Amino acid sequence: CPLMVKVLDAVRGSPAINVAVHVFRKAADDTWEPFASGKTSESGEPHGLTTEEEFVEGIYKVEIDTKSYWKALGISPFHEHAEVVFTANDSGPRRYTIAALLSPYSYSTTAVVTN
Amino acid sequence: CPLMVKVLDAVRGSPAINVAVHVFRKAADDTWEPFASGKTSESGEPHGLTTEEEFVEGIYKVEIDTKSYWKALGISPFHEHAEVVFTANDSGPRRYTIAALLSPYSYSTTAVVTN
Amino acid sequence: CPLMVKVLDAVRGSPAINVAVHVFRKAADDTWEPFASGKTSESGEPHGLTTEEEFVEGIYKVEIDTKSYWKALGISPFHEHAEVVFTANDSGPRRYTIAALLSPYSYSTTAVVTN
Amino acid sequence: CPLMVKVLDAVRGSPAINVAVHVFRKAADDTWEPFASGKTSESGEPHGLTTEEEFVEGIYKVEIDTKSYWKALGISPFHEHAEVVFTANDSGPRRYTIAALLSPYSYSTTAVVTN
């Protein structure tokens, strides 16, 4: 798994479960093409997003459906979603983990890029 | 000022100065229309983004050009930008402060909403 | 005001009001001596914590009473408090803003240091 | 492992390696007693901090040596350390993960408490 997403809930102190995660890759015509998607498991991760063959260099967007998550918990959210946009560059062997920490009026994201 | 943006640098421990901030509003055809833009001052804020008359109900996107900021400091950044997407004024006019905290491989954002 | 504290609530999207803030300074015997304390106003800040004369070089601790804040809102919190520990004025007098963002199971803090 | 600590670096986009982690438990006399310690591995975690038998209810403090970490990377840090203080209550079967995200002038922490 060269691309992993981990979503945590800062209100309940737990992984954010049943969250929709959509991944897009910037096409040559500058539009966002669907790339991969899933729903977070009990661990807060959508399993098997992509492969080493499909995940080439490019600009990617990871859209997390935070609005549906907070609505399902009966909590009033601020954001429509959380979108993380980054260039993936292969320098040496690399795996990307995009971690997101959610609060109703805030989110934090970080990337963990390992050899 | 019904819409304020405050940008901080978590590496240098200071306001993030000379950062481009672009605001868009979702059109009826689902596209992102330009709404307002500016550059952060010494306080990390772009002054005078919009007015109470222009800032109507709708879906807004605040895009912070974090990539050009880190490149100007000679630091290799991960993200293309930091984008915050939210519905504004659905229950009547509100004042919105969007705060962003930047690191080369991470960012946090929060909203402070007042009547 | 050489030492400022700003506290925000990531659940409600507002300043965290009526929060107790306690400041200590490390004594020569390595114990924590009381230095200053206050209560956050409607803006999420305790006004007038210290002066340029009193705020000398040293190691300071800013303890934010997040537990009483969440209990007063009927929300079960994880942390006993949020504590920020730092050396101040080692290279000469500076102005320090300690910003804290609160969630029931998480907090973020950042420092903005200016000459 | 009922108590886990995970430390990430927001500047390098990686786990924070070789970071000292010290855990204390509040004694009946209100002092902080040493409980467990270790140094983070390649994954940003100190392995085998405690056991289900030793990790009883109480008030715990997790101190992360962020200052030595940033100094070892040649980066000027703000904080002396990052301290996370919380009550551990057993309601049902529970595991605690304390996650910390580090920047030179900022840190974020969250707790993940699972059944």
CSV table of C-alpha atoms in Angstrom, one decimal, chain C:
chain,number,residue,atom,x,y,z
C,1,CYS,CA,1.8,42.7,27.5
C,2,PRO,CA,4.9,40.6,27.0
C,3,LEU,CA,3.0,37.4,27.6
C,4,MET,CA,-0.4,36.7,26.0
C,5,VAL,CA,-2.5,33.5,25.9
C,6,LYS,CA,-5.3,32.8,23.4
C,7,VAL,CA,-7.6,29.8,23.9
C,8,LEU,CA,-10.0,28.5,21.2
C,9,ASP,CA,-12.8,25.8,21.3
C,10,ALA,CA,-12.6,23.5,18.2
C,11,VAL,CA,-16.1,21.9,19.1
C,12,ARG,CA,-18.1,25.1,19.2
C,13,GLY,CA,-15.9,27.2,16.9
C,14,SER,CA,-15.5,30.0,19.3
C,15,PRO,CA,-13.0,31.5,21.8
C,16,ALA,CA,-12.9,29.3,25.0
C,17,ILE,CA,-14.4,31.7,27.6
C,18,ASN,CA,-14.1,31.6,31.5
C,19,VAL,CA,-11.0,29.3,31.3
C,20,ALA,CA,-8.5,29.5,34.2
C,21,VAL,CA,-4.9,30.2,33.1
C,22,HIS,CA,-2.0,29.7,35.6
C,23,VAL,CA,1.6,30.7,34.9
C,24,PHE,CA,4.6,29.4,36.9
C,25,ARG,CA,8.4,30.2,36.8
C,26,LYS,CA,11.1,27.7,37.6
C,27,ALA,CA,12.9,28.6,40.9
C,28,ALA,CA,16.7,28.1,41.5
C,29,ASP,CA,15.8,24.9,43.6
C,30,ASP,CA,14.0,23.4,40.5
C,31,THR,CA,10.4,23.9,41.9
C,32,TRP,CA,7.6,25.7,40.1
C,33,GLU,CA,6.8,29.0,41.8
C,34,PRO,CA,3.5,30.8,41.1
C,35,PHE,CA,4.0,33.7,38.7
C,36,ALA,CA,0.6,35.0,37.4
C,37,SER,CA,-3.0,33.7,36.8
C,38,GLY,CA,-6.2,34.9,35.2
C,39,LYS,CA,-9.5,33.9,33.5
C,40,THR,CA,-10.1,34.1,29.7
C,41,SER,CA,-12.5,36.9,28.6
C,42,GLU,CA,-15.1,36.7,25.7
C,43,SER,CA,-12.1,36.9,23.3
C,44,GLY,CA,-10.5,33.8,24.8
C,45,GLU,CA,-7.7,35.8,26.4
C,46,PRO,CA,-6.8,36.6,30.1
C,47,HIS,CA,-5.9,40.3,30.0
C,48,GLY,CA,-2.8,41.7,31.8
C,49,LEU,CA,-0.9,38.5,32.9
C,50,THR,CA,2.5,40.3,33.5
C,51,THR,CA,4.7,43.4,32.8
C,52,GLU,CA,8.1,43.9,31.0
C,53,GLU,CA,9.6,44.6,34.5
C,54,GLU,CA,8.4,41.3,36.1
C,55,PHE,CA,8.8,39.0,33.0
C,56,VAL,CA,12.5,38.3,33.3
C,57,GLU,CA,14.6,35.4,31.7
C,58,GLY,CA,13.7,32.0,33.0
C,59,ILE,CA,11.7,28.8,32.4
C,60,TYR,CA,8.0,29.3,32.4
C,61,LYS,CA,5.0,27.0,32.5
C,62,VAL,CA,1.5,28.1,31.2
C,63,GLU,CA,-1.1,25.7,32.6
C,64,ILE,CA,-4.6,26.0,31.0
C,65,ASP,CA,-7.5,24.5,33.0
C,66,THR,CA,-9.1,22.5,30.1
C,67,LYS,CA,-10.7,20.0,32.5
C,68,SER,CA,-12.9,22.5,34.3
C,69,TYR,CA,-13.8,24.1,30.9
C,70,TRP,CA,-15.1,20.9,29.3
C,71,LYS,CA,-16.9,19.8,32.6
C,72,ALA,CA,-18.7,23.2,32.7
C,73,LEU,CA,-20.0,22.4,29.1
C,74,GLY,CA,-21.1,18.9,30.2
C,75,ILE,CA,-18.5,17.2,27.9
C,76,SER,CA,-16.2,14.5,29.4
C,77,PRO,CA,-12.6,15.6,28.7
C,78,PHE,CA,-9.5,13.4,28.5
C,79,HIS,CA,-6.7,15.7,29.7
C,80,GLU,CA,-6.2,17.2,33.2
C,81,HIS,CA,-5.0,20.4,31.6
C,82,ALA,CA,-2.9,21.7,28.7
C,83,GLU,CA,0.7,22.7,29.9
C,84,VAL,CA,3.2,24.7,27.7
C,85,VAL,CA,6.8,24.9,29.1
C,86,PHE,CA,9.5,27.2,27.5
C,87,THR,CA,12.6,29.3,28.1
C,88,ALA,CA,11.8,33.0,27.8
C,89,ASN,CA,14.0,36.0,27.0
C,90,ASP,CA,17.3,34.1,26.8
C,91,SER,CA,18.5,36.3,23.9
C,92,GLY,CA,16.8,39.5,25.3
C,93,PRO,CA,13.2,40.5,25.9
C,94,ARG,CA,10.6,39.1,23.5
C,95,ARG,CA,6.7,39.2,23.3
C,96,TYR,CA,5.1,35.8,23.5
C,97,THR,CA,1.7,34.8,22.4
C,98,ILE,CA,0.8,31.2,23.4
C,99,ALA,CA,-2.3,30.0,21.4
C,100,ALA,CA,-4.1,26.8,22.4
C,101,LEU,CA,-6.8,25.0,20.4
C,102,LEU,CA,-9.0,22.6,22.5
C,103,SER,CA,-11.0,19.5,21.7
C,104,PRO,CA,-12.2,17.0,24.4
C,105,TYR,CA,-9.5,14.4,23.5
C,106,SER,CA,-6.9,16.7,21.8
C,107,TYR,CA,-5.2,20.0,22.0
C,108,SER,CA,-2.7,22.0,19.9
C,109,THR,CA,-0.5,24.8,21.0
C,110,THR,CA,1.7,27.2,19.1
C,111,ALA,CA,4.0,30.1,20.1
C,112,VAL,CA,4.3,33.4,18.2
C,113,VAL,CA,7.5,35.2,19.3
C,114,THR,CA,8.2,38.8,18.3
C,115,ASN,CA,11.0,41.3,19.1
